Amino acid sequence: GAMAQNITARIGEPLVLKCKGAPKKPPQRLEWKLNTGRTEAWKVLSPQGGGPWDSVARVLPNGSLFLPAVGIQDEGIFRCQAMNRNGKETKSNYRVRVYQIPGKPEIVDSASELTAGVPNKVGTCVSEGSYPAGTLSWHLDGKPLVPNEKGVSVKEQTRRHPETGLFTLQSELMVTPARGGDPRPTFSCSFSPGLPRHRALRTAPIQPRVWE
Template sequence: MAAGAAARDWVLVFSLWGAVVGAQNITARIGEPLVLNCKGAPKKPPQQLEWKLNTGRTEAWKVLSPQGGPWDSVARVLPNGSLLLPAVGVQDEGTFRCRATSRSGKEAKSNYRVRVYRKGSGDFHGATFIKGKGSSPSRAPWSPEIPGKPEIVDPASELKAGVPSKVGTCVSEGGYPAGTLSWHLDGKPLIPDGKGVSVKEQTRRHPETGLFTLQSELVVTPAQGGAPHPTFSCSFSPGLPRRRALHAPPIKPRVWDPVPLGEVRLVVEPEGGAVAPGGTVTLTCESPAQPPPQIHWMKDGVALPLPPSPVLLLPEVGPQDQGAYSCVVAHPSHGPQESPVVSISVIETGEEGLTAGSAGGSGLGTLALALGILGGLGTAALLFGVVMWQRRRRQGVERKVPENQEEEEEERAELNQSEEPEAAEHNAGGP
């Protein structure tokens, strides 16, 4: 059986003779067999030789010899000392070396630099490829696998000045050789410095095709006061002469320049927060922060299960709606900020002196105190007016009493005067 296997190998050698390459720089078509000749090797066993391979399939130099078994069906040494690659792949690009010692003790070395190409390509790089026995050498084409244009995935729509933010991830798939990715800002190259600009790169190779996938994630810290809409772009460079770079469509995220935090105000309508049963109360949270932050609502110190909104509407207010309300402004770069508290109260219809809600819990007490003072002053003024009116009335009565007495005395005097003449006349006419 060993003889039969050796015979089959010799038949394969002669059938593939046209693929034997003797030049130092060679090319091979992907998917087809390749035979590399070992110069100076004895034509018959036993042979003293070894092959060393350094390709995309090996982490370092790998050694093959006639006595060793086939290497994962990738390559094996034939009986004449030649190296057979049954099906050349992209990962077989690299360096092949053979060192052989003849029966007379003479040593010979063979070195090959193998590159692969795709069928139908038209690029020529000067390697000699022998078509068949006795035929003349011809120029063999070699072509890299150029991927499509790179793409920026997960692009950012907004960035914050002074805050490290991810711009996006540039992806290039299906290239060979690997090539490189690079970022640009407003047409100028971005150089990673680990501070304002950082790049995380990743390279993967397909286990079957040998083609590369590149990823490059860009994180920047925009300067405050910079351009509001910078232009970021990514490009793929094949790393080959006379090959143009491929550019991804640019993106223009908006840069927010946070301003110092101002006071958060909580406006209540109706003013004061006091409302009759069934009425409506509107709370509006005002914040000067930019960009507009998310606003959440709290009642009596507990977060309300409501979606973020700058306005809180309380329709058909009842006793269950009474309490202390506040809004919380969420600043991504500064942390949360809470507004002063506003008290909402329900006042039954007909009650006098409606009390008003108070900001921070103190406005209601102050307003109630003011109304109490005004009510006390009004009552005191009323009492004072009544007292004065009664006093004046009493003084008027006192004034009328003497006048009546004088009139009575005058009447009495007149009557006395009239009675005295009558008495005198009566006395004069008597017997």
């Protein structure tokens, strides 16, 4: 597409998109065009408003576009074109990407004892309520665990809430511990978001005993 400002909007929060260059109050010559999961290509929104779109997105007195509660389907493109009193045209281009933060990740079913030199089921990590899906990853004593690499095996499952569309992730970790290692290793699980710049939420660690 065109040069745009990337906007990250949280599901359920309001969103205000600013229409640069517009007069501060009516009378205003401005037009909003949006292309989202709600639209068939471009939909035009005007200060006068009206119709079903008034329940979803409406032009504010200052010309900004307001969404009371952003949903998954509001991902797409939002553009404004406005003329100031003189007549210079100004354009505003926004790429809106939506997200939701899951609840804290939880280690359900953990092993209290591992046996060295054999593959062991360590635990299952569960994360509920993310958008987009995101990923679950495992850590040993603070260091990332890489699947397949020398005794680590991870299997994963992604489920979708039938009405909200939010994702639930579940990850199972198996390790083949090496003879002569830490007999009380510390495993943790963490959620990594899809959209850039978000923090990693981590689980309480689990400290099993390793038998040589």
